[PDB]
Design a protein around this ligand. Structure first.
Ligand SMILES: *[C@@H]1O[C@H](CO)[C@@H](O)[C@H](O)[C@H]1NC(C)=O
Lengths: 195, 234, 219, 214, 219
């Protein structure tokens, strides 16, 4: 039958910025999670609440695949119960997370001579995010009591900021492509199963 | 080698049409936002139009002077960029560049550049819009003499006279002689034709032995001339 | 308790640079911003630039846009400003300023200020002052003093009778002579009647060289 | 960038009077980003007013800011003794281009006092170094402007005088300044009459003190 | 459209002197999302395609010398060659890539140089041209500075007028001189009724106006 189109997610050309991260629903297919572990060399493949060796034996209502790009020293924030700019302001996993996160170094794809300034993250925000929330706002962040009126200045700062992804950067500061697999088990029929 | 090779220009009557094209090699073309930039003779650079890669939508953008008449397109299977010009005006007379400029700040290519560079331009194709007719040039020698001699060196040259339109190309001895060649900018005579001079200094010792032949090629009139330039007693 | 503490005074030679620090303690630094200001001796306030601690985004005055840098270390709650290619006209006092912030929001004005950092830019070298007397030479009220001449860098302090003589004591600001060294005078007014009975010794301290001098002043 | 101009340069007011300080902008600017600072000598600036009309935490009521567009005013209703200082306005709109004014000094007003002028001969100990320092002293006078001309014998001297003036006293609210003529030892021993000429508002006619040596 | 405008239009300094170019945009080209100015500088020499010099306002392209330094922010930018060299004689355009692509008017940078007098040469018509009814006499001036050069054709000492045209070269990249060719064109009939054909050159580096001439009975 139909194979789950993991090539479209993992092998995409353009990846979303972390603040405007990207969800892809997966349904009506059979996934070979064993092959996914050995499909390549991933620098990270932490599973949560499931063993990927025995994930091929379960069925789920639907599977959500979230993908984006972050720094190397921020991949550790893509885990339950984390803190930091990426976890608090960009992409937040729940404490009861039941899925695997996956990452690999993408200096070959997402860094540029003189600086790649197309990859952005959220710097300022009024509050931390709820799990799986996504804020793509762009309004000037009011830090004082004076209203900003859509104009940058003192105490009026633009909410987003860009990685200066350079090829000669250290691997901690290099771009990494994260892909998070969420598994949902509801009262409905299950359309995504192993072999 | 990464290279941009434009082609398909010359003389075209006003209100007419013409397709420029640019053949690229040496890089992954399909990932680059290519633009055309033009330059009227003696004037500055003027952006004509960009087309984005297929990954980023393929959306085109044109400048107002040409929006409504020009059409840019790709053939990624042949790594060629096109520019369709219709209802041509005399203010379109310019040399046209295909270029990768403006792209690397947005496109998907990474740091692995084949030569550490990302900004590339072709040599350029000139388009003359004119209701005038083509005319081949007359090639006349400028003979070396005691009147063109000082300190062991001797100037000689070629006269490329009464032609339309630009350009002509001039090489000496089939490209063997290159050192010391000056080609003067063409001047537009009032009759509407062009004229320029190509000179080269040589050691006068050789004048009795060496053969100097200037090869003039004028593409729009399909005229090719090879002229022996011999010494004359003055 | 809520403050900005800057570096110590600097003496610098032309062509070099200088990096002043500004460590904040007492408030939410990561949401604040630091601006940099200088002011020469007895002159107006000159704006240098400012940085946003959360982003590090900087903006310098057109006057310094080439030869100035402003940076921040969040882990030490410190802003730095670096001025390149120091000239004599850079001899000034440098200030950092920030608005108080809390866990909630920030103030809408630069209300916190540092102590101020003196930066002397000169080609001179450290030297101890040669103090000289001003001869006291009416029916009453006489004038005497001493002259602190040729020293570098600033400052020098002047006491009279080890802090006993305070009324009528005028210690003037220094001036910068052509030779590149400073020179300042000090004066007291004393009753002419007790010119011979009372003994007047003026005390001088120039800490940048450990030079300390007391000098008697007699008619 | 934008330019701010404060008016006037100096205010001469007594305690309890009313000071009006003006700050005029070269272009129209937003009231949200105009501030006023106070500064005593040796201290850092101190924020009185922000947002043109708001007082910073703990500023007495007698400080009041007003304005909009290009004309901004700071008013001190009844002048306290702890209020005589230098005042600056600052515009800080946009992320770039901020500026200060040239500043207005506010000083205590008092009845005119004339200077008592003292001239000083150089020390014998100093002549051994090769240079001579003649010193003129003006003591406890108001107002602050004055002129001290140096006359050697009867030759007016120019280009070899340096001046230095104090802050006005907190007791008698007067000023004091010193001018030090500088000459080489050789040029000093050639002339005999060294005179210091002082003009001041409180002086009916100019005052000359001098000595005979050299 | 976003509109680029440069000042000045032309620029001339001695070897090793400082050259500056200015660029003004209609809107700001500072992108808030990354605090980057989206503009570049290009250099172009005659007959060549332009070469990228600077991008992101200040980022040098590889191979560009250190004399080149981009600066500015928002809508006001400056390109500065710190010590102009003989091979920087070109036209320098500023380009924005913030919204599509727009180039400025360009700025021509030229080298001020020590005076050089020209070498005057002269060629008579070809028998091939005379076969067709016309006689073109060429005059050639070699390696002169400044550019201002007066070339008058005399024919048996009769000043000519309206029958000659000139062409100047690019300023040389090595010794910064100019060359020039002036073509006098007569009919074959009018050409044979006269004897002496002369090229008279007035130039600054010449004491008296120099003449290169030839006789038709000696050619
Ligand atoms: C992505 O492509 C590579 C080779 O093109 C392949 O080995 C890999 O399995 C692909 N990814 C997925 C998820 O299928």
């Amino acid at each position: 039958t139909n194979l789950c189109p993991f090539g479209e997610v993992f092998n995409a050309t353009r990846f979303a910025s972390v603040y405007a991260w990207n969800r892809k629903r997966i349904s009506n297919c059979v996934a070979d999670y064993s092959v996914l572990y050995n499909s390549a060399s991933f620098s990270t493949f932490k599973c949560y609440g499931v063993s990927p060796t025995k994930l091929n034996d379960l069925c789920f209502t639907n599977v959500y695949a979230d993908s984006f790009v972050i720094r190397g020293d921020e991949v550790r924030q893509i885990a339950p119960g984390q803190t930091g700019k990426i976890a608090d302001y960009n992409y937040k996993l729940p404490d009861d997370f039941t899925g695997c996160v996956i990452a690999w170094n993408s200096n070959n794809l997402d860094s540029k001579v003189g600086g790649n300034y197309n990859y952005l993250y959220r710097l300022f925000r009024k509050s931390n995010l709820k799990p799986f929330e996504r804020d793509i706002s762009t309004e000037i962040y009011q830090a004082g009591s004076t209203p900003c009126n859509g104009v940058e200045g003192f105490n009026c700062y633009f909410p987003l900021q860009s990685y200066g992804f350079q090829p000669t950067n250290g691997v901690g500061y290099q771009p990494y492509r994260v892909v998070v697999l969420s598994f949902e088990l509801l009262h409905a029929p299950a359309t995504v199963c192993g072999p | 080698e990464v290279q941009l090779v434009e082609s398909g220009g010359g003389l075209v009557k006003p209100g007419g049409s013409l397709r420029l094209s640019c053949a690229a090699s040496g890089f992954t073309f399909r990932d680059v936002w290519m633009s055309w930039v033009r330059q009227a003779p003696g004037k500055g650079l003027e952006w004509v139009g960009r087309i984005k890669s297929k990954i980023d939508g393929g959306t085109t953008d044109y400048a107002a002077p040409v929006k409504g008449r020009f059409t840019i397109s790709r053939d990624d299977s042949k790594n060629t960029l096109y520019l369709q010009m219709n209802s041509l005006k005399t203010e379109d007379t310019a040399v046209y560049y295909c270029t990768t400029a403006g792209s690397y700040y947005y496109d998907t290519v990474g740091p692995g550049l084949p030569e550490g560079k990302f900004d590339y331009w072709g040599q350029g194709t000139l388009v003359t819009v004119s209701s005038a007719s083509t005319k081949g040039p007359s090639v006349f020698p400028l003979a070396p003499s005691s009147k063109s001699t000082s300190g062991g060196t001797a100037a000689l040259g070629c006269l490329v006279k009464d032609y339309f339109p630009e350009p002509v190309t001039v090489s000496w001895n089939s490209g063997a002689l290159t050192s010391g060649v000056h080609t003067f900018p063409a001047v537009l005579q009032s009759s509407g034709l062009y004229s320029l001079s190509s000179v080269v200094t040589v050691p006068s010792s050789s004048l009795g032995t060496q053969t100097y032949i200037c090869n003039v090629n004028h593409k729009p009139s399909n005229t090719k001339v090879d002229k022996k330039v011999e010494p004359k007693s003055c | 308790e809520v403050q900005l503490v800057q570096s110590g005074p600097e003496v610098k030679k032309p062509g070099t640079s200088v990096k002043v620090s500004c460590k904040a303690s007492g408030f939410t630094f990561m949401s604040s911003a630091v601006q940099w200001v200088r002011q020469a001796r007895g002159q107006r306030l000159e704006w240098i630039g400012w940085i946003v601690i959360g982003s590090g985004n900087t903006n310098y005055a057109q006057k310094f846009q080439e030869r100035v840098t402003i940076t921040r270390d969040m882990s030490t709650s410190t802003a730095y400003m670096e001025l390149s290619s120091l000239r004599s006209e850079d001899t000034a006092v440098y200030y950092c300023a920030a608005p108080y912030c809390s866990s909630i929001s920030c103030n809408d004005g630069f209300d916190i200020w540092g102590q101020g950092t003196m930066v002397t830019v000169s080609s001179a070298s450290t030297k101890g002052p040669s103090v000289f007397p001003l001869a006291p030479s009416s029916g009453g009220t006489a004038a005497l003093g001493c002259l602190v001449k040729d020293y570098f860098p600033e400052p020098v302090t002047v006491s009279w009778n080890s802090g006993a003589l305070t009324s009528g004591v005028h210690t003037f600001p220094a001036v910068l002579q052509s030779s590149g060294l400073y020179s300042l005078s000090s004066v007291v007014t004393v009753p002419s009647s007790s010119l011979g009975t009372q003994t007047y010794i003026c005390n001088v301290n120039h800490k940048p060289s450990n030079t300390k001098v007391d000098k008697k002043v007699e008619p | 960038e934008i330019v701010l101009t404060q008016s006037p340069g100096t205010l001469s007011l007594s305690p309890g009077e009313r000071a009006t300080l003006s700050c005029r902008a070269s272009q129209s600017v937003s009231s949200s980003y105009l501030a006023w600072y106070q500064q005593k000598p040796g201290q850092a600036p101190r924020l009185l007013i922000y947002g043109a009309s708001s007082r910073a935490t703990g500023i007495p009521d007698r400080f009041s800011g007003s304005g909009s567009g290009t004309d901004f005013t700071l008013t001190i209703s009844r002048l306290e003794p702890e209020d005589f200082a230098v005042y600056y306005c600052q515009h800080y709109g946009s992320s770039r281009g901020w500026t200060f004014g040239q500043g207005t000094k506010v000083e205590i007003k008092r009845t005119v006092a004339a200077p008592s002028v003292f001239i000083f001969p150089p020390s014998d100990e100093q002549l051994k170094s090769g240079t001579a320092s003649v010193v003129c002293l003006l003591n406890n006078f108001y107002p602050r402007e004055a002129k001290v001309q140096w006359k050697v014998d009867n030759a007016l001297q120019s280009g070899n005088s340096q001046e230095s003036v104090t802050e006005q006293d907190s007791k008698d609210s007067t000023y004091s300044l010193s001018s030090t003529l500088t000459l080489s030892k050789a040029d000093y021993e050639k002339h005999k009459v060294y005179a210091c000429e002082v003009t001041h508002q409180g002086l009916s006619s100019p005052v000359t003190k001098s000595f005979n040596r050299g």
